[PDB]
Amino acid sequence: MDSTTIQQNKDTLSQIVVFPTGNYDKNEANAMVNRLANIDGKYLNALKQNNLKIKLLSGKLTDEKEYAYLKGVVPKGWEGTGKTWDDVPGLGGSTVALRIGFSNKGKGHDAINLELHATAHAIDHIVLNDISKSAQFKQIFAKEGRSLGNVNFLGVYPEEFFAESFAYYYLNQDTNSKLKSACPQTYSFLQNLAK
């Protein structure tokens, strides 16, 4: 990724990312946008065209009017954790909402990166028309979906294997190399998807 392309992607994200009202960590919000700018510009442009907003939050997701209906609800795959959506720091799918400061593994989740995982879900659902549930990806998932850990979540839900693999592919060179070694068919699939 050259200088102009990273800048172009940040420009696209300037039309996608929504910052919270009130006090928030501006530096960390900027760092999250910079990580999202590593995503292939084709996907970011499609998110913008679809008026998908990436909402950065300074408080709980369920304190937003549009997610209040999830109070007390246990997310898919979170059975037995003792947590509900009130405790979950990010959400992706038909919308994206993310708590600032909770990017890294261990900040209330075990994803390699919160914002890439959530945005991957939006790309899957909105841009790629649920490609993670296509026969092609289900076949890859059947072979490689238990090779990235967290097998009772990533190994059981193809959309979660897709989202986490996408996050590995786009976070940094180290995670990208790890994905290629663990899940070569998934890596090739993502490489071809971006063409």
Partner: peptide, 7 residues
């Protein structure tokens, strides 16, 4: 559709 991160 809503999806949480890895638990």
């Amino acid at each position: 559709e809503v999806n949480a991160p890895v638990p």
